Amino acid sequence: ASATRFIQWLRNWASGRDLQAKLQLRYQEISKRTQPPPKLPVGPSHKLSNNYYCTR
Amino acid sequence: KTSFGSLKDEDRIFTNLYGRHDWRLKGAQSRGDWYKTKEILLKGPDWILGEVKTSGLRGRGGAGFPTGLKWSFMNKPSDGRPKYLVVNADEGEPGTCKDREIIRHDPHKLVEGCLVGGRAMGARAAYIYIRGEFYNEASNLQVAIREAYEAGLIGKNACGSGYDFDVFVVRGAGAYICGEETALIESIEGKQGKPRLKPPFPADVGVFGCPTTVANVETVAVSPTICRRGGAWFASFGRERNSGTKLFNISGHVNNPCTVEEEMSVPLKELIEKHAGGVTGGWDNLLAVIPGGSSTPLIPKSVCETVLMDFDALIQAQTGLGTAAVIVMDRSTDIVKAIARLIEFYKHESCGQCTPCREGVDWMNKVMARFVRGDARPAEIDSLWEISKQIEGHTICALGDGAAWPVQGLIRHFRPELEERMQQFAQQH
Ligand SMILES: Cc1cc2nc3c(=O)[nH]c(=O)nc-3n(C[C@H](O)[C@H](O)[C@H](O)COP(=O)(O)O)c2cc1C
Numbered sequence: 001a002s003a004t005r006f007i008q009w010l011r012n013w014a015s016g017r018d019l020q021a022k023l024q025l026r027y028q029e030i031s032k033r034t035q036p037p038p039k040l041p042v043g044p045s046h047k048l049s050n051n052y053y054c055t056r
Numbered sequence: 057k058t059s060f061g062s063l064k065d066e067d068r069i070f071t072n073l074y075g076r077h078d079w080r081l082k083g084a085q086s087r088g089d090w091y092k093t094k095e096i097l098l099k100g101p102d103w104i105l106g107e108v109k110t111s112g113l114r115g116r117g118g119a120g121f122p123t124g125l126k127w128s129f130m131n132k133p134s135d136g137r138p139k140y141l142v143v144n145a146d147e148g149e150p151g152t153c154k155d156r157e158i159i160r161h162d163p164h165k166l167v168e169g170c171l172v173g174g175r176a177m178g179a180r181a182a183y184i185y186i187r188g189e190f191y192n193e194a195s196n197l198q199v200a201i202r203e204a205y206e207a208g209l210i211g212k213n214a215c216g217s218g219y220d221f222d223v224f225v226v227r228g229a230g231a232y233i234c235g236e237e238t239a240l241i242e243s244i245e246g247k248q249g250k251p252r253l254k255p256p257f258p259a260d261v262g263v264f265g266c267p268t269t270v271a272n273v274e275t276v277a278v279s280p281t282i283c284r285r286g287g288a289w290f291a292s293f294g295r296e297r298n299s300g301t302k303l304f305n306i307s308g309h310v311n312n313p314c315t316v317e318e319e320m321s322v323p324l325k326e327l328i329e330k331h332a333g334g335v336t337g338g339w340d341n342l343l344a345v346i347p348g349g350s351s352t353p354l355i356p357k358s359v360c361e362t363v364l365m366d367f368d369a370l371i372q373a374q375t376g377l378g379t380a381a382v383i384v385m386d387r388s389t390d391i392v393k394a395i396a397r398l399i400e401f402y403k404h405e406s407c408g409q410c411t412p413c414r415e416g417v418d419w420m421n422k423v424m425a426r427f428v429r430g431d432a433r434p435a436e437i438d439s440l441w442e443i444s445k446q447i448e449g450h451t452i453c454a455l456g457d458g459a460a461w462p463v464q465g466l467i468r469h470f471r472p473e474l475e476e477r478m479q480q481f482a483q484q485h
């Protein structure tokens with residue numbers, strides 16, 4: 001991302017692609033390394049009634 | 057007949073129910089007790105069992121088995137062991153206090169009932185098991201028994217009939233479970249009142265390991281009058297297969313709570329109004345009725361309008377006649393709390409022997425405590441229903457069923473009240 005305008009033009013022309021739109025190196029677009037806690041859902045056997053094991 | 061009720065005084069059996077006549081032998085004889093007892097005994101066990109059979113009498117202790125057939129299990133030859141009659145005077149079902157009146161006001165009816173019932177079974181003696189709290193009543197019974205012994209009506213050559221018969225009174229020590237017939241026997245044998253599994257049946261292996269029949273106080277005490285007046289006289293009262301007269305206890309939210317003798321199949325509404333003075337605050341103030349002791353499911357006012365008071369009619373209403381203890385709850389009642397207290401009762405009375413009642417009833421009690429406060433989720437109502445079905449039919453004795461049925465009655469008829477209680481709690485918190 002720090003490449004000068006001339007170098008961007010040079011390596012774009014050499015490759016034939018717009019390399020600046022799809023850089024191999026990751027910058028700020030990645031997910032934050034700290035996330036809010038999850039709260040995961042429970043399966044279909046998490047019931048208080050009509051749930052005898054012999055039926056499932 | 058199609059209408060039942062309005063029993064006439066001449067057709068009542070317990071004619072000293074209220075203790076306004078001499079309860080001792082002289083008074084008892086003037087009222088017809090101990091009359092032609094010798095002729096009854098000499099008629100033979102087969103004749104006595106036939107008269108009780110034709111009477112259509114059914115057990116008055118709560119379960120209602122045909123009495124004549126039940127007592128016929130004993131009518132079998134000797135095999136060396138003594139045979140006994142055990143009279144169940146434990147009288148422990150909440151709401152039920154009928155057997156108390158028989159013992160203290162009509163003891164000689166019970167004593168004669170033991171002898172006649174004892175003869176039909178071939179039993180050498182009768183043990184009357186009476187709850188420990190009934191101290192004064194037991195002392196009355198002992199006095200009557202001594203009068204019978206002195207008059208030669210019981211004991212050696214009882215009533216001059218050549219039949220030897222003793223009557224012993226044994227007191228309990230505080231346990232509802234000892235009303236259960238096998239737990240009663242275990243208690244007499246000096247053990248914890250824990251019911252036995254069946255088989256064997258008491259008619260094969262009973263008290264002291266000998267043939268026994270356990271009969272309710274009311275069942276035994278009406279037998280001498282049935283033999284005197286005939287089985288057909290008894291069967292003329294009540295519906296078919298619901299024969300006879302019955303002692304009813306009307307308690308709770310009625311104007312004049314009382315014990316009364318009435319015909320079987322009398323309408324529940326008629327019984328409450330004619331004898332108990334009606335529901336407190338008027339009939340329309342009625343909420344629910346427990347028709348036959350705390351072990352029978354409640355029924356709402358709508359069911360109570362037309363339901364008859366007998367075994368078959370109440371089974372059709374998804375409940376039971378039980379002991380015929382009518383507990384009335386008006387609309388001021390906290391129905392959820394009232395049932396929760398009965399579950400607390402069964403939790404205190406469970407003998408703890410077998411897993412589903414030892415652990416299940418205590419579990420139901422904890423859930424009901426939260427349901428009283430609304431401190432639960434609606435999904436727990438179906439869970440509580442399912443828990444009660446895992447107790448019912450899986451325990452050693454019927455106390456487990458007796459704790460499951462009241463819960464089922466509440467959920468069946470008052471689920472909206474349970475859900476409303478939960479909504480209120482959640483909004484507040
Ligand atoms: C928990 C429990 C308590 C009982 N309490 C009594 C009782 O107090 N009096 C009684 O006669 N039967 C009681 N029974 C019923 C007896 O076990 C038995 O069915 C009855 O004594 C049989 O007598 P019957 O045929 O004359 O009704 C109780 C049963 C259970 C399960």
Ligand code: SF4
Nearest residue numbers: 407409410413451453
């Ligand atoms: S059901 Fe309850 S009272 Fe009956 S044997 Fe089991 S634990 Fe004891």
